[PDB]
Amino acid sequence: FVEMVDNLRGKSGQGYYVEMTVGSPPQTLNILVDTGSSNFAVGAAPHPFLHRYYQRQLSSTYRDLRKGVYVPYTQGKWEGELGTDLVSIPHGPNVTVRANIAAITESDKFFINGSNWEGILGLAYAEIARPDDSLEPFFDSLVKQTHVPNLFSLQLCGAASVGGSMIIGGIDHSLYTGSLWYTPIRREWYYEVIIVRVEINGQDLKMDCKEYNYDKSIVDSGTTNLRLPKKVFEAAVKSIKAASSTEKFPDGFWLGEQLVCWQAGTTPWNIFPVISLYLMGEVTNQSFRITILPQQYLRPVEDVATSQDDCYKFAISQSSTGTVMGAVIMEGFYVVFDRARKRIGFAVSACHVHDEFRTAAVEGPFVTLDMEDCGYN
Numbered sequence: 235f236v237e238m239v240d241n242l243r244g245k246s247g248q249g250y251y252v253e254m255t256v257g258s259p260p261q262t263l264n265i266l267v268d269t270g271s272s273n274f275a276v277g278a279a280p281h282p283f284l285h286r287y288y289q290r291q292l293s294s295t296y297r298d299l300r301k302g303v304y305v306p307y308t309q310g311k312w313e314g315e316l317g318t319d320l321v322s323i324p325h326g327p328n329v330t331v332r333a334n335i336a337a338i339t340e341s342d343k344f345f346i347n348g349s350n351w352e353g354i355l356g357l358a359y360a361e362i363a364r365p366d367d368s369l370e371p372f373f374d375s376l377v378k379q380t381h382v383p384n385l386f387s388l389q390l391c392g393a394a395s396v397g398g399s400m401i402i403g404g405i406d407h408s409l410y411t412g413s414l415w416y417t418p419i420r421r422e423w424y425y426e427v428i429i430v431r432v433e434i435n436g437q438d439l440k441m442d443c444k445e446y447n448y449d450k451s452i453v454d455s456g457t458t459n460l461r462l463p464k465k466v467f468e469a470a471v472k473s474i475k476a477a478s479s480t481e482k483f484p485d486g487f488w489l490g491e492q493l494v495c496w497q498a499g500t501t502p503w504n505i506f507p508v509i510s511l512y513l514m515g516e517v518t519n520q521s522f523r524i525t526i527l528p529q530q531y532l533r534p535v536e537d538v539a540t541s542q543d544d545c546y547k548f549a550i551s552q553s554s555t556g557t558v559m560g561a562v563i564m565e566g567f568y569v570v571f572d573r574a575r576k577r578i579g580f581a582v583s584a585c586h587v588h589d590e591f592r593t594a595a596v597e598g599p600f601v602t603l604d605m606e607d608c609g610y611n
């Protein structure tokens with residue numbers, strides 16, 4: 235699996251991408267790694283933001299499915315033409331598979347100007363595929379057509395350019411320290427999980443745990459932030475704001491409507507608390523917790539023409555679609571998407587940014603009663 239180590243790159247805020255090839259002869263494209271969706275879709279026309287795009291006319295192995303897809307998100311969108319073709323991952327397993335590919339022919343607020351990726355690899359399940367669950371996701375095709383075991387793991391690092399590893403078919407123990415702890419995939423649509431308890435600084439939010447998961451909690455490599463549901467984010471920041479009363483900041487800041495700047499080499503690490511999510515464990519009444527530091531929820535914004543300090547975006551925010559464990563969480567951990575056993579493993583990442591003080595942790599077991607009641611139906 236050392237072949238796969240360091241096969242991810244990116245820039246802060248613009249996600250993590252892997253090199254893939256499509257068609258015969260092979261066309262090289264950089265493809266965003268997304269556990270939050272389930273379509274394999276690639277730029278297929280000369281949109282000016284794109285370094286390159288899929289040229290179906292050049293591929294002897296292309297096949298038209300003669301059907302379109304339309305994919306609207308919150309304020310962005312793409313649209314494309316469905317087909318199949320031969321797909322490899324140069325720094326991945328030594329196999330080639332025939333996968334569905336959406337040739338993106340129109341889009342809005344999807345591709346990023348200045349970015350170095352040209353498509354998206356949806357690694358979640360068929361249930362949330364588009365147009366419907368009959369379009370076989372890529373990882374499904376990979377597992378059917380080859381002997382690649384039904385799992386992948388992600389070590390997301392990064393600082394500027396970011397980096398990481400996507401180990402397809404397995405686990406690389408150099409990527410983590412201590413033990414893996416597993417939480418069940420509650421249902422195979424998103425990578426859905428259940429948070430059973432939340433502590434800020436060790437003190438807990440004493441919230442009905444059902445709220446922590448209103449209406450979903452998912453693990454998503456295509457989202458930067460830890461996103462928390464209205465009511466939970468509400469209480470969430472209430473406690474973080476109180477934990478950090480030493481210094482003052484605007485409301486808009488906590489709303490991600492403003493940035494906050496401290497002078498260089500002089501940010502208050504310690505005036506923010508370590509935050510801990512308890513996840514449902516593998517055994518009745520047993521949980522574990524994963525703990526992140528503010529270096530995860532306080533993310534720099536590279537630079538500005540209108541300033542030159544250490545200016546950070548508060549990486550926690552609200553949602554009407556649920557908790558989203560994005561890069562803020564995943565960069566603290568080696569994350570194992572154990573599809574064969576319907577579970578997600580968390581271990582302390584060998585590349586997480588730590589001090590000589592506080593440190594990301596994955597600890598258990600804890601005793602948590604009524605953890606099913608925490609799931610929203």
Ligand SMILES: Nc1nccc2ccccc12
Nearest residue numbers: 268270271307454456457
């Ligand atoms: N994961 C993911 N994939 C595509 C679009 C998104 C928009 C907002 C959050 C996550 C997304």
